[PDB]
Amino acid sequence: NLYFQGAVDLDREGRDPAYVESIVKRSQKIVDKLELTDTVAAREVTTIIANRYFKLNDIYETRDAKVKLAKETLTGDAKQEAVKAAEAEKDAALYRTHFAFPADLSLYLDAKQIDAVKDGMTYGVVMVTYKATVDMIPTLKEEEKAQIMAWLVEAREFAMDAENSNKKHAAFGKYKGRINNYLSKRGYDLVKERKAWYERIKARGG
Amino acid sequence: NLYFQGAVDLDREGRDPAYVESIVKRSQKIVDKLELTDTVAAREVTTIIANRYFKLNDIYETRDAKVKLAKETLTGDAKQEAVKAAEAEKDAALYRTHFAFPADLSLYLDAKQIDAVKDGMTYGVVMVTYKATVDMIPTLKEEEKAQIMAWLVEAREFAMDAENSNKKHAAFGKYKGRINNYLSKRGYDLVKERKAWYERIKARGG
Ligand SMILES: [Cl-]
Ligand SMILES: [Cl-]
């Protein structure tokens, strides 16, 4: 499956060609899982995803340059304030660019397909985590399931903008922590549920 | 239709009661247009919307205090840099809180209803603008319509977070400018289309 640009320009200029190729291949792999039937649309979506990876890269490079300058020049509270300001500026750049991404995708993809792109950019952690949680506690109430999914989908919106795998898993981890705490406050004995789950996994040949 | 809090706490503490009442009434009016059939869900959604108005208010109050301090203490480039930093910090606060809002709404509302809330918070400018544009140029291509709608929906995502009516209309205005420029670059004679549209409006008794 050889990628070629379509109408959407690939933001390749001035970038290391091996990096560009790695991002395009990553992006192609996400698009493959959509099983699109319009080969031109598939190229366009590939480019849109790649360009978003590249722009995120640039945002984080900017942030890192500011933090490097702070490490070299500042200490104590002044240093922490400069790091805080760089992080706010990073989150601002994410805000300013976040909505254009599904806007652009929507020219080619429906809502379900756009969600599948989000999942592709975030290792499908939403459904892995949701399925595991309901496997662990099969009598969760519908409202508990709904809240758990809502938090995972929120986590995904942040994770898709994160810098790398480590930071993506940290974003999910925050909301997994929230889920854990939520269930314990709602009266579930998580030690007991988890122990019984492991027994069920063994009993079914997992 | 008297509002009463449900399970979601209204973020009322320390706020002027007339302001609280005004925001609750605004929020109730948005929810009324959803025509929900679960009266408890309607109260919860009312509270969620009101609480988002209140949090946006607080974000803008923070931003304004920083800009006031800059006006009182700084001039020239230093002043512009402090204003820039306050705006980045504001956009950061918007980013950090934006995704929780539809997450919370999703416990009560489907995707279509959530969009109707977004429209309610933004004076329905998306559909007014879209309908007017297709009325003005009825032979737009499907891809042009799609791009126009995508830009209006993007505009809405920013507008729903804006401070007031003036700033909401400015957010839409940016993307209306983009639409105007887009159509002229795609070969439409906007002077001619607009003139012929006005004739059609007159001919139909508008
Ligand atoms: Cl190419
Ligand atoms: Cl109340």
CB A89 within 8 A of CB B86: no
A122: nearest Cα among A159, A167, A171: A159
Q: Which residues contact A184 (CB under 8 A, 6 or more apart)?
A: A190
Number of H helices, E strands in chain B: 9, 0
Interface residue B111 vs chain A (CB under 8 A): yes
Instruction: Decide: B100 and B72 in contact? Cβ < 8 Å.
Output: no
Experimental method: X-ray
Q: Are A151 and A178 in contact (CB under 8 A)?
A: yes
Read off φ and ψ for residue A11, nearest 5 degrees. Answer: -80, 70
Measured distance CA(B130)–CA(B110) in Å, rounded: 23
Integer Cα distance of A170 and A180 in angstroms: 15
Residue entry with tokens 């998580």: A190
Distances (CA, A) of B199 to A57, B130, B134, B138, B184: 51, 19, 15, 14, 21
**Cα dihedral across residues A113, A119, A124, A126: positive or negative:** negative
* Domain spans of chain B, in order of start: 1-206
> What does the buried/exposed string (b/e) look like for B64-99 if buried means 16 or more CB atoms within 10 Å of the residue's CB?
eebbeebeeeeeeeeeeebbebbbbbbbbbbbeebb
PDB resolution in Å? 1.7
Residues 6+ apart with CB under 8 A from A131: none
Whether residue B83 contacts residue B67, with contact meaning beta carbons closer than 8 Å, is answered with: yes
Nearest-angstrom CA–CA distance, B106 and B100: 10
DSSP letter assigned to residue A9: P
Pinpoint the alpha helices (H) of chain A.
17-32, 39-73, 76-98, 100-105, 111-120, 125-136, 142-159, 165-185, 190-203
Q: How far apart are CA B89 and CA A85, in angstroms?
A: 8
Q: How far apart are CA B76 and CA B85, in angstroms?
A: 14
A 129-148 residues with CB < 8 A to B = 143, 146-147
| B46 C-alpha to ligand 2 centroid (Å) | 11
Please, which contacts does A158-164 make with residues 24 or more away whose CB atoms are closer than 8 Å?
A158/B99, A159/A121, A159/A122, A159/A125, A160/A118, A160/A121, A160/A122, A161/A56, A161/A94, A161/A98, A162/A56, A163/A56, A163/A60
Q: How far is the CA of B9 from the centre of ligand 2 (A)?
A: 8
Instruction: Annotate A76-121 with DSSP letters as a single string.
Output: HHHHHHHHHHHHHHHHHHHHHHHTHHHHHHTTT--HHHHHHHHHHT
A111 and B CB contact within 8 Å: yes
In chain B, which residues have their Cβ closer than 8 Å to the Cβ of A88?
A: 85, 88-89, 92
Distance CA B18, CA A134 (A): 45
Cβ neighbors of A158 (< 8 A, separation 6 or more) are A171, B99
